[PDB]
Design a protein around this ligand. Structure first.
Ligand SMILES: CCCCCCCCCCCCCC(=O)OC[C@H](COP(=O)(O)OCC(O)COP(=O)(O)OC[C@@H](COC(=O)CCCCCCCCCCCCC)OC(=O)CCCCCCCCCCCCC)OC(=O)CCCCCCCCCCCCC
Ligand code: 07D
Ligand code: 07D
Ligand code: 07D
Ligand SMILES: CC[C@H]1c2cc3[nH]c4c(c3C)C(=O)[C@H](C(=O)OC)c4c3nc(cc4[nH]c(cc(n2)[C@@H]1C)c(C(C)=O)c4C)[C@@H](C)[C@@H]3CCC(=O)OC/C=C(\C)CCC[C@H](C)CCC[C@H](C)CCCC(C)C
Ligand SMILES: CC[C@H]1c2cc3[nH]c4c(c3C)C(=O)[C@H](C(=O)OC)c4c3nc(cc4[nH]c(cc(n2)[C@@H]1C)c(C(C)=O)c4C)[C@@H](C)[C@@H]3CCC(=O)OC/C=C(\C)CCC[C@H](C)CCC[C@H](C)CCCC(C)C
Ligand SMILES: COC1=C(OC)C(=O)C(C/C=C(\C)CC/C=C(\C)CC/C=C(\C)CC/C=C(\C)CC/C=C(\C)CC/C=C(\C)CC/C=C(\C)CC/C=C(\C)CC/C=C(\C)CCC=C(C)C)=C(C)C1=O
Ligand SMILES: COC1=C(OC)C(=O)C(C/C=C(\C)CC/C=C(\C)CC/C=C(\C)CC/C=C(\C)CC/C=C(\C)CC/C=C(\C)CC/C=C(\C)CC/C=C(\C)CC/C=C(\C)CCC=C(C)C)=C(C)C1=O
Ligand SMILES: CCCCCCCC/C=C/CCCCCCCC(=O)O[C@H](COC(=O)CCCCCCCCCCCCCCC)COP(=O)(O)OC[C@@H](O)CO
Ligand SMILES: COC(C)(C)C/C=C/C(C)=C/C=C/C(C)=C/C=C/C(C)=C/C=C\C=C(C)\C=C\C=C(C)\C=C\C=C(C)\C=C\CC(C)(C)OC
Ligand SMILES: [Cl-]
Ligand SMILES: [Fe+3]
Lengths: 257, 274, 47, 305, 44, 47, 44, 47, 44, 46, 44, 47, 44, 46, 45
């Protein structure tokens, strides 16, 4: 029956469906442009020169830089076209572009693989009030652990093999998100040395009365090499990245190093 | 080619099996041993699907359909032309999906991240395995599996639902639906909030966690926060799948009647059974 | 038995007990209203 | 086992606070509370809620609609609380029959449904203005209101816009639990199986894709949560290793990846397109396609019967 | 609450609850006179 | 009575009141249109 | 709100509510003259 | 009795009471419209 | 809130509630005169 | 028995009690309206 | 709660529960006289 | 066996035990109400 | 919990189970007299 | 064999057993109620 | 987490308790067997 027809065979529902397919293809192009605001252009794996297999859609592939305005009055561009140095403290196992790298030295201190981090700003994340967000409870007297929970302070810090790394001496809290981000651990060896421990790299074990912070990521010997921070009461985004990357590398490297 | 930050992460190691032999990249793709076995099962199962299309009556993509054996075969292996093809494709697909999950584990190991993604994908695999293995085994015939075809799997859904009079009345199906709708709602809200904070408008500075929490406190009186929403969004999607699996293990293996008639227990409760 | 008030707070006990006994009583009256014999508001005969 | 970051073990407290907004006619209402179990999943603060003129309007219109429904449901069991509970899921308020067109039906013959529907519609549209204006007050983008507009477009298509195209309310949706399910069943059967409606197929693909994306994205952010990945807007404005490793996991897995910002656009568009393509599939049904299986046979979805 | 305020509230509470039950008892009597609600053996 | 405006904000009062009265007025006009006798636009007879 | 401006608001409120009720009362009178809305024993 | 205004904030009381009384009144008028005898708009006889 | 504020509110409240109950009683009387709502033994 | 007001806050008590009594009263009037014998608005005969 | 405070509460609780059971026992007696709820062999 | 109370908190134990015994008792009465023979409220004959 | 306190609780617990089982046994006896629940060979 | 209580926590053993044994007992009573021969409440003939 | 004499103490009460539990159950099974046995003969029940 003639109701929907546009031609002998063509009809409105079919036309509306192809109009959707045209829209959806255009949307995928838009979405893929947004996906390319970090990391692009692509580079040759060996030389690091800007190269990749590209069609004529290359001309629409990467968007003009959008500018984010930060409440400090600084800005961030995306794409910024900044890229990592071509040289790293590792070498390929075979000369082909697809080959993996082997670390030249200690990968955890050389910051390669899961020990690698981004060169974030040497600035702390800020509260809406402009104060640094992540600070020890020593400096945030209005914060407290909820009365229902175990306070980590004074607990021993223990690795997966049962060696004591130290004791918890402070909590670093995020004033903006209202959460514990790090524990500040005084080391058992070189007593008086303090290191940050990412709180999500821990759990509290309380099956036995002398409850303890267990750390699966790294062994007790690795705590002495945890990256240091420049200030005693604030931490930059770069220092956060450096510390968190170090512990994330433990699952691959801690039985090597 | 590589992303501007990729090279420093492309280290050796993290493989579950096979050692160094497979530990390399083909363009953007990581290979590994489970990459190879992914390709093995993928090519086999795909070519067997195309073979089934060549055997069948049409090349119209929507109409192509590889069907399970007749229920009269029970759980025996059928002849290739009589449903055995569907059986080989099914176990090749299991091989492919399991290989894909284990390949993701190797990538997680190399990057020092947690295993949440292959774990979550394991619920997709379990849902597929429930429909093509567990349910037909408990019902005693491979012929209860869904056919591999663009429209014919939807026909199987239709036939299977109306076999129980009206599938909307399955209580686990109602809960599965609720969680699927809630997942899409939560995703719409989560995508919107991050974009509204990152893109406040021309002449406005990027907003942070306090604004993010304040928007949903102002609108609906609660904020789950930036970590909680990813926990919730994951749990919602996985629970929707779990209840979908339950609704299908109920229908046929356990409960065989009309789902509308099941609810008559409610009207018979003694405090209102007048 | 007075030592049970060393086990339990009287404030909590009474609020819980009031809630329990009301719901129980409401349940029982609704059960009776579902019967032919004991629905007093409809008053079927004892044939 | 390592910490999987699914539940917050130790959670902190502080004085409740929120971002400033300009003074209105109404302050933020309620004393902020905290609950321990919400603090395990997420933030603990059961914070104050904003009212405002648009909030008053939406709740008043919506309350009247809910009362009109609820009173009609209880009236349909002759006010019996026992039969109300016994029958609750089966109770519904039905639209008018087709002979009334789009004029006001008699109250008992769907006039109450028309009033309830109008008041519910108005309340929802006022809630859209609320979701919009709360973002502008916080100097945030309006993305949430525009996502909500897609859900509303399906709701309006179901309840009013298709009736307007059909010229009567008879195939509009009844207010009732099993009744609106029965409407969904009968609508598919009357128009020749909704599985063959391609816009229903699209709507399903985006519904499945939304659960796919949230499973992928939720698992991704938790996988990088020991690297600070849950701090997404900070990662958007200063790319950390968490955003780098999230990108590389997906690139190495499937050959391509998003950014920390753009994954939220993929999320936004998939959930929107579920209801948008849904609404189009409803508006084409009966207006230009009377039987979707027959349309499917014409366009090669199925062999000729 | 203090003993003195507890004692005081109890006085006004006692007066008002007795008024409430008194009015209710009058309402029940009038309804009983209109239509009693305990059926006989043959019903109503 | 004027003391009420020190107890309540006059703006909150007028917004609440205007909201209530519009919704009530709209409800009553729709109710009358939903009737045979009082739907002035359809204009049925007084039979 | 001061007592001075409370009393001025109360004046304008008192005038406007009475005018609103006055117009509404006349509207009800006209509608009653057209079609009254209390039925007799035999209905309308 | 006047001590109740020491116990309760009038700003909460009068709004809660006004809301309560309206919802009760709306319910009662709706109930009457549902009846034959008291639906004044429908105007059934008392034969 | 002082005793003086409480008693100031109370007397205005007492006035307003007695007005409201007076008008409601008048309304109930008129409705009863139109159609009573307690049925006899044989119904209405 | 007056010591119950040392045990419980009168403000919470009266709000709870007023809510309870209203909902109970409304329930009973709805129950009666659903009966044949006691629906005063319909007025069936005895 | 002290020992004496527990013993004092137990006194008021004990009288209250016995009064509650006493009213309930009388209600059950009146209901039994109206219609007993244990059926004989022939049923009711 | 008084050493049970050195394993288990008597307060927690009594709350759990009372909750279990109520739910069990309530189950058994509902089971009997479902039978012909033991539904005392319906009171079928022992034919 | 100290031994004397555990023994004190056990004394009252022991007394309570005996009362509870005693009442329940009396209840089961009366129900058995009304209608026994172990059927013979022909059933009930 | 008392060494088993150094191996397993006695408090978990009792809570585990009580949970297991109740669920098992309840299962067996419901299985018997599903049979003509042993459903004592219905009491069919042999 | 418990000492030798403490494990032995628990074992003593456990051994008593389980024998009491099995003794009541064996009595219950005997009564049920006398009522209706649950091993069918060759002709069935
Ligand atoms: C053997 C088994 C094979 C099973 C089937 C597999 C299908 C997919 C093919 C997978 C293999 C592709 C390999 C490849 O392309 O490598 C390029 C790379 C050299 O490249 P390069 O130098 O590094 O430069 C590349 C770069 O410039 C390109 O740009 P960019 O980096 O921004 O993007 C990367 C691409 C990569 O894409 C892929 O690899 C495939 C992506 C997945 C396609 C899945 C299609 C089917 C699903 C439904 C589609 C739906 C589309 C709409 O990223 C993309 O293109 C991503 C596009 C994403 C669009 C998402 C849309 C979602 C919509 C969902 C549906 C909604 C419905 C309502 O190669 C080399 O280095 C040399 C050595 C390898 C040579 C490869 C030769 C060809 C292999 C073909 C395999 C056999 C295929 C049958
Ligand atoms: C339109 C202007 C211009 C034009 C010359 C051009 C033409 C073609 N492109 Mg393209 N494209 C252009 C621009 C551009 N392009 C892409 C991408 C991709 C990827 C994945 C996206 C996909 O799902 O596409 C969806 C469709 C979209 C985006 C529209 C262009 C493609 C069409 C109409 C071809 C569709 C027909 C097929 C048989 C299927 C092709 C294979 C797959 C999708 C796997 C995929 C392989 C692809 C295929 C092709 C083909 C076969 C052709 C032919 C026939 O000439 N294009 C995106 C990407 O990530 O690239 C790595 C992306 O960013 C981007 C940009 C900006
Ligand atoms: C007449 C039909 C009748 C009707 C009344 C009705 C209606 C509705 N229902 Mg339903 N339904 C009916 C019958 C019926 N119903 C379901 C199911 C559901 C679920 C589906 C999601 C899910 O399960 O995802 C389970 C997920 C799986 C199985 C995951 C599969 C994917 C995997 C492993 C990965 C695959 C990957 C590749 C192959 C790679 C390819 C290559 C490349 C891309 C390059 C969901 C909750 C649900 C929703 C609704 C709604 C919203 C409605 C509305 C609005 O009316 N229904 C199915 C299920 O539970 O399955 C476990 C099931 O089988 C079944 C039946 C027979
Ligand atoms: C026999 C049944 C038959 C069978 C073949 C089949 C089966 C399946 N289908 Mg389907 N379906 C059938 C019929 C049918 N199907 C749909 C729709 C869909 C979409 C809904 C998207 C959405 O988000 O909805 C959900 C969103 C809505 C409805 C819009 C947002 C909601 C709003 C604004 C309301 C806000 C609420 C308040 C403020 C509260 C007010 C309070 C009170 C009233 C008391 C979704 C993708 C989808 C899924 C599947 C699956 C998974 C299956 C499987 C596995 O079988 N189906 C709707 C539509 O869009 O159709 C194009 C629609 O109308 C319609 C019909 C009639
Ligand atoms: C469990 C929660 C949700 C979920 C999660 C989820 N899915 C995932 C992941 C996660 C977390 C991944 O990491 C993984 C991924 O890589 O995503 C990009 C994946 C994935 N989810 C996918 C799809 C998918 N997920 C779905 C659903 C869901 N996925 C759930 C809603 C659906 C539905 C409901 O329809 C689909 C289609 C893929 C994009 C991807 C897995 C890719 C993969 O396994 O690749 C290797 C295999 C192949 C390339 C092809 C193998 C071919 C076989 C040999 C034959 C298969 C034939 C088949 C049996 C029949 C087909 C006919 C149809 C018409 C029925
Ligand atoms: C993109 C598609 C998905 C989507 C998106 C979506 N939904 C949304 C949004 C978005 C982006 C919102 O912004 C909005 C929201 O607020 O989310 C939190 C909303 C929303 N999605 C909703 C529901 C919903 N979404 C659904 C689905 C979907 N939503 C899709 C999957 C579904 C279903 C069936 O799948 C439902 C049921 C709501 C929770 C919310 C919109 C709320 C709204 O409009 O409320 C209007 C008001 C009322 C109903 C009235 C309430 C009245 C109270 C009882 C008053 C009590 C107090 C008062 C003071 C009394 C006064 C008495 C006096 C007047 C006498
Ligand atoms: C960057 O990070 C971000 C955050 O932080 C900064 C965030 O915070 C959020 C925001 C997200 C959240 C706060 C939590 C999201 C969680 C979910 C979607 C999953 C669980 C569901 C909800 C929390 C409900 C969502 C809806 C809400 C809160 C209502 C919004 C609307 C109003 C307040 C007004 C109108 C609606 C009202 C008054 C109530 C609506 C109804 C319900 C909530 C359901 C009530 C239940 C029923 C009707 C019963 C149904 C079931 C029945 C009958 C049978 C079973 C019985 C039951 C009792 C269930 C995001 C997205 C985010 O990106
Ligand atoms: C924090 O925010 C996050 C981001 O980041 C910042 C993100 O990005 C994402 C990710 C999300 C998005 C980018 C959004 C878009 C995604 C979706 C909408 C989800 C749906 C996805 C798709 C539609 C894409 C589907 C594509 C898939 C599954 C990939 C298909 C590819 C293959 C099967 C090939 C795999 C390759 C392997 C195993 C190895 C290499 C092989 C080849 C390149 C080709 C074949 C092989 C050869 C040529 C040679 C080698 C062969 C051998 C040895 C074997 C030979 C023998 C044979 C038999 C073949 C998320 C979640 C996120 O939260
Ligand atoms: C001219 C004379 C010859 C001399 C030159 C010869 C040598 C050169 C040839 C290169 C072409 C082959 C490589 C193709 C990949 C090259 C890279 C690529 O993506 O190309 C696009 C086509 O991709 C692709 O079809 C990739 C396709 C991959 C998957 C193919 C599957 C085929 C089998 C299943 C089919 C049925 C499925 C079922 C259908 C229902 C086209 O560009 P386009 O700008 O959009 O790129 C996006 C980018 O530019 C954005 O930055
Ligand atoms: C007071 O105490 C309480 C709250 C307990 C009272 C009780 C409340 C209860 C129990 C309420 C229960 C409600 C239920 C069970 C609701 C179920 C609702 C469902 C499932 C609804 C599902 C879908 C409905 C849809 C999509 C309807 C949409 C209708 C629309 C959009 C209609 C619009 C109509 C218009 C605009 C009419 C225009 C015509 C005019 C009025 C202009 O002329 C006639
Ligand atoms: Cl966890
Ligand atoms: Fe996110």
């Amino acid at each position: 029956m003639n109701k929907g027809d546009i031609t002998g065979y063509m009809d409105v529902a079919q036309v509306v469906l192809y109009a959707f397919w045209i829209f959806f293809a255009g949307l995928i192009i838009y979405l893929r442009r947004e996906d390319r605001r970090e990391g692009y252009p692509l580079e040759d794996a060996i030389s690091g020169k800007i190269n990749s297999l590209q069609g004529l859609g290359s001309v629409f592939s990467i968007a003009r830089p959008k500018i984010f305005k930060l409440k400090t009055g600084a800005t961030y561009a995306a794409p910024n076209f900044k890229r990592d140095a071509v040289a790293i403290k590792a070498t390929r196992t075979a000369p082909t572009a697809g080959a993996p790298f082997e670390p030249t030295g200690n990968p955890m201190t050389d910051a390669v693989g899961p020990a690698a981090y981004a060169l974030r700003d040497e600035l702390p994340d800020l509260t809406l009030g402009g104060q640094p967000a992540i600070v020890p409870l020593r400096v945030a007297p209005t914060f407290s652990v909820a009365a229902e929970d175990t306070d980590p302070r004074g607990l021993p810090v223990v690795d997966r093999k049962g060696a004591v790394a130290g004791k918890v001496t402070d909590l670093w809290i995020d004033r903006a998100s209202i959460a514990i981000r790090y524990l500040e651990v005084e080391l058992a060896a070189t007593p008086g040395r303090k290191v940050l421990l990412p709180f999500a790299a821990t759990r509290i074990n309380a099956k036995t009365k002398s409850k303890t912070v267990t750390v699966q990521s790294i062994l007790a010997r690795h705590f002495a090499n945890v990256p240091t921070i420049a200030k005693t009461d604030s931490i930059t985004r770069r220092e956060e990245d450096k510390v968190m990357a170090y512990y994330s590398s433990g699952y691959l490297y801690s039985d090597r190093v | 080619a590589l992303l501007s930050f990729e090279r420093k992460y492309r280290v050796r190691g993290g493989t579950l099996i096979g050692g160094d032999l497979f530990d390399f990249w083909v363009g953007p793709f990581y290979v590994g041993f489970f990459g190879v076995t992914t390709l093995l099962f993928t090519v086999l199962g795909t070519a067997l699907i195309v073979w089934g299309a060549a055997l069948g009556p049409s090349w119209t993509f929507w109409q192509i359909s590889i069907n399970p054996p007749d229920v009269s075969y029970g759980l025996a292996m059928a002849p290739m032309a009589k449903g055995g093809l569907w059986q080989i494709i099914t176990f090749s697909a299991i091989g492919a999906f399991v290989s894909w999950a284990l390949r993701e584990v190797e990538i997680c190991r190399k990057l020092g991240i947690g295993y949440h993604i292959p774990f979550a994908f394991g619920f997709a695999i379990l849902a597929y395995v429930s429909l093509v293995v567990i349910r037909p085994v408990m019902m005693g015939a491979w012929g209860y599996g869904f056919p591999y075809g663009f429209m014919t799997h939807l026909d199987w859904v239709s036939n299977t639902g109306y076999q129980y009079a009206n599938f909307h009345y399955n209580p686990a199906h109602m809960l599965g639906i609720t969680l699927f709708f809630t997942t899409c709602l939560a995703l719409a809200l989560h995508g919107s909030l991050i974009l509204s904070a990152a893109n406040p408008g021309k002449g406005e500075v990027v907003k942070g966690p306090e604004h993010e929490n304040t928007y949903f406190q102002d609108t609906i009186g609660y904020s789950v926060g930036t970590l909680g929403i990813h926990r919730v969004g994951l749990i919602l999607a996985l629970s929707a799948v779990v209840w979908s699996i339950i609704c299908m293990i109920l229908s046929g293996p356990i409960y065989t009647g009309s789902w509308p008639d099941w609810w008559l227990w409610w009207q018979k409760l003694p405090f209102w059974n007048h | 038995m007075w030592r049970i008030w060393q086990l339990f707070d009287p404030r909590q006990a009474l609020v819980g007990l009031a809630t329990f006994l009301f719901v129980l009583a409401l349940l029982i009256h609704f059960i009776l209203l579902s019967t032919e014999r004991f629905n007093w508001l409809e008053g079927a005969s004892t044939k | 086992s390592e910490y999987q970051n699914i539940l917050t073990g130790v959670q902190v407290r502080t004085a409740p606070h929120s971002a400033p907004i300009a003074k209105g006619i109404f302050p933020r209402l309620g004393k902020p509370g905290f609950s321990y179990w919400l603090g395990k999943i997420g933030d603990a603060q059961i914070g104050p809620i904003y009212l405002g003129t648009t909030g008053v309007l939406s709740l008043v219109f919506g309350f009247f609609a809910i009362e009109i429904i609820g009173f009609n449901l209880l009236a349909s069991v002759n006010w019996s609380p026992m039969e109300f509970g016994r029958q609750f899921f089966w109770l519904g308020l039905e639209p008018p029959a087709a002979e009334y067109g789009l004029g006001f039906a008699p109250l008992a013959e769907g006039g109450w449904w028309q009033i309830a529907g109008f008041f519910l519609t108005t309340s929802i549209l006022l809630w859209w203005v609320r979701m919009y204006r709360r973002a502008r007050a916080l100097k945030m983008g309006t993305h949430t209101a525009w996502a909500f507009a897609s859900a509303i477009f399906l709701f309006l298509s179901l309840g009013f816009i298709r009736p307007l195209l059909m010229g009567n309310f008879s195939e509009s949706v009844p207010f009732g639990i099993f009744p609106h399910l029965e409407w969904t069943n009968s609508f598919s059967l009357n128009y020749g199986n909704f599985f063959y409606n391609p816009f229903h197929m699209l709507s399903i693909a985006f519904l499945y894709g939304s659960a796919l994306l949230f499973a992928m994205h939720g698992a991704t952010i938790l996988a990088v949560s020991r690297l600070g990945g849950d701090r997404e807007v900070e990662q958007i404005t200063d790319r950390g290793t968490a955003a780098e490793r999230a990108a590389l996991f997906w690139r190495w897995t499937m050959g391509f990846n998003a950014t920390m910002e753009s994954i939220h656009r993929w999320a936004w568009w998939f959930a929107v397109l579920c209801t948008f393509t849904g609404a189009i599939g409803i508006l084409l049904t009966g207006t230009v396609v009377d039987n979707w299986f027959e349309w499917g046979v014409k366009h090669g979805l199925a062999p000729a019967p | 609450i203090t003993e003195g305020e507890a004692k005081e509230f109890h006085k006004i509470f006692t007066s008002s609850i007795l008024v409430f039950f008194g009015v209710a008892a009058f309402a029940h009597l009038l309804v009983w006179i209109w239509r009693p609600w305990v059926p006989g053996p043959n019903g109503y």
